[PDB]
Design a protein around this motif. Structure first.
Motif, short mmCIF file in Angstrom:
data_model
loop_
_atom_site.label_atom_id
_atom_site.label_comp_id
_atom_site.label_asym_id
_atom_site.label_seq_id
_atom_site.Cartn_x
_atom_site.Cartn_y
_atom_site.Cartn_z
N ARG A 85 0.87 -1.17 0.00
CA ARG A 85 0.00 0.00 0.00
C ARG A 85 0.91 1.22 0.00
NH1 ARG A 85 -4.89 0.69 4.22
NH2 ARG A 85 -4.29 2.85 3.80
N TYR B 11 -14.66 1.32 -5.52
CA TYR B 11 -13.90 0.14 -5.08
C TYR B 11 -12.39 0.42 -5.11
CZ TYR B 11 -13.08 -4.81 -4.14
OH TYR B 11 -12.70 -6.00 -3.57
N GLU B 13 -9.71 1.06 -1.99
CA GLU B 13 -9.47 1.16 -0.56
C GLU B 13 -8.42 2.21 -0.21
OE1 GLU B 13 -8.09 -2.87 -2.00
OE2 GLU B 13 -8.95 -1.05 -2.88
#
Ligand SMILES: CC(C)CCC[C@@H](C)[C@H]1CC[C@H]2[C@@H]3CC=C4C[C@@H](O)CC[C@]4(C)[C@H]3CC[C@]12C
Lengths: 121, 115, 26, 37, 34, 105, 118, 27
Positions: A85, B11, B13
């Motif tokens: 991420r 969609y 995150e």
């Protein structure tokens, strides 16, 4: 045996296959060529490593393999699967790090104060 | 379908949102409340808006081979700045403020002495 | 995240040392 | 984690305000001291 | 999570700088009184 | 043999059709079950090298993959528009504290 | 033409599309029709309390009667999360608080300093 | 927990200030 080295800083990501340090190696992403395809100059390979930017979590995070010249991707059995991420200009620090920086601040300010006080006699 | 080609991309995150339209054209530009701020070159089809914490808003429009299509607007509220206003924190507000200003007054009282 | 532990015991720790030194000197 | 963020920003505003007040007290203190000395 | 942690770090640093400033002001007021 | 990495809502798993051999990294908790390994919680930054062979029909071919997760919940977003200000005001504060204490004698 | 106006107060939200002196006003969300023999939906008034982000978001249309919900000018995306009694502050708010703090502390400190000096 | 932390910080800060006053008086 030699594990892959991954360095994530900001948004740019650098990926290395250190198995062959004496020559150049191309790269793969689920047997699909990426980087330096006369378009999307941001996504490009290097002499020995990978250099990708604007990393996405949904796409471009799968299986990577480093392969010699004219070698099938299934030859090497040391694959690569990573998830990230990516957080631009945004790193990770744990509580000892902030504790040490606060202690350093205290030490330097106290040392400066003591030095000027002693200098003043 | 329905002159509503613009469609927000969902969609995700991560801290970013996107929008897209289904239209094929060359050298497309974008309109912010009708003004020329947006531009799209080749090799890119989905435009990027920004993070959801930046509170974006305004009008957005897409068009292609068809004439000027029908736009839409978005609104966001993720603040990361809102402050509590219940009685559990305004009491602390007042206590801290009053204590600090009382200490200030004591200091200035003693300062107003020797001179 | 780091929550209170990074912020609670850190400054309360040094200021507590300030009180202790003050008491001994006085 | 929302409550932690709300308390955090409330404390940040508190301490910015306290810094402002301490700055004004320093200003008056240094004005008076430089006048006397 | 990313934004919250910097908020905590910033509030901690600002509290420390507040303590330093109040120590400064106490020192100055004490000196002017002597 | 590419080893598949399955993923539940909050569990990360590695599955292959033979015994998985640990050499380096983190396993989480020791697992007595064979032909399957449990790594740990999603937010744990699991780093490790895992090695298992081929299947019965794919005998005598090793399969080693490196797995890393960068999903950090302890990372801090670094904004240069605030750290510079706080460091410069701390520098001013210590400079002026030194001035004040020097004035004391 | 004019964008839909929203004024979120507390945990309750408000919205309507008053672009006409006299006209029929409706409200649609993924082509649903609920209300008319939780959600506050009136013939000319729309509101909603306890605005949950996950289960209350998406698209909104306010279009007079006589057609399908596919001819109104524009849609509206309202991904919003709201807490209980949490006013949100912005540039105008902080400056006013700082300036009123300066005024109050300066006035009181001057008063006490002058009174103490005798 | 942050509320308790701030309350304790303020109480101990006031105690520190008053004890600095008392100590500097006795010198
Ligand atoms: C919190 C800050 C801003 C203000 C607090 C006020 C402090 C700095 C003031 C209030 C009263 C002051 C004291 C008043 C009288 C004396 C006696 C003198 O022989 C030495 C200094 C000494 C001991 C002063 C030291 C500074 C002092 C303690």
């Amino acid at each position: 045996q030699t594990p892959y080295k991954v360095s994530i800083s900001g948004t740019t990501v650098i990926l290395t296959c250190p198995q062959y340090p004496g020559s150049e190696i191309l790269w793969q992403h689920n047997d699909k060529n990426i980087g330096g395809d006369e378009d999307d100059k941001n996504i490009g390979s290097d002499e020995d490593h990978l250099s990708l930017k604007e990393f996405s979590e949904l796409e471009q995070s799968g299986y990577y393999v480093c392969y010699p010249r004219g070698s099938k991707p299934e030859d090497a059995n040391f694959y690569l699967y990573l998830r990230a991420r990516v957080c631009e200009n945004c790193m990770e620090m744990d509580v000892m790090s902030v504790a040490t920086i606060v202690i350093v601040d205290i030490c330097i300010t106290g040392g400066l104060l003591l030095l000027v006080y002693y200098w003043s006699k | 379908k329905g002159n509503h080609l613009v469609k927000v991309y969902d969609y995700q995150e991560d801290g970013s949102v996107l929008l897209t339209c289904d239209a094929e054209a060359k050298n497309i530009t974008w309109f912010k409340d009708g003004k020329m701020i947006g531009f799209l070159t080749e090799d890119k089809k989905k435009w990027n808006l920004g993070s959801n914490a930046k509170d974006p808003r305004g009008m957005y429009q897409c068009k292609g081979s068809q004439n000027k299509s029908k736009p839409l607007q978005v609104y966001y509220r993720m603040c990361q700045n809102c402050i509590e206003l219940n009685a559990a924190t305004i009491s602390g507000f007042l206590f801290a403020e009053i204590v600090s200003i009382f200490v200030l007054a004591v200091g200035v009282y003693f300062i107003a002495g020797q001179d | 995240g780091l929550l209170d532990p990074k912020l609670c015991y850190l400054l309360d720790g040094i200021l507590f040392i300030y009180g202790v030194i003050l008491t001994a000197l006085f | 984690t929302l409550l932690l963020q709300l308390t955090n920003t409330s404390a940040y505003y508190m301490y910015l305000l306290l810094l402002l007040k301490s700055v004004v007290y320093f200003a008056i203190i240094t004005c008076c001291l430089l006048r006397r000395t | 999570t990313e934004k919250v942690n910097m908020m905590s770090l910033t509030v901690l640093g600002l509290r420390m700088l507040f303590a330093k400033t109040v120590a400064v002001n106490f020192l100055l007021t004490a000196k002017l009184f002597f | 043999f590419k080893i598949p990495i399955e993923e539940l809502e909050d569990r990360v798993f590695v599955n292959c059709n033979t015994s998985i051999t640990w050499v380096e990294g983190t396993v989480g908790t020791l697992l007595s079950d064979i032909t399957r390994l449990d790594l740990g919680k999603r937010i744990l930054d699991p780093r490790g090298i895992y090695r298992c062979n081929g299947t019965d029909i794919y005998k005598d071919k090793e399969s080693t993959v490196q797995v890393h997760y960068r999903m950090c919940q302890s990372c801090v977003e670094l904004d240069p528009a605030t750290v510079a200000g706080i460091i410069v005001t701390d520098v001013i504060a210590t400079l002026l504290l030194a001035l004040g204490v020097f004035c004391f004698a």
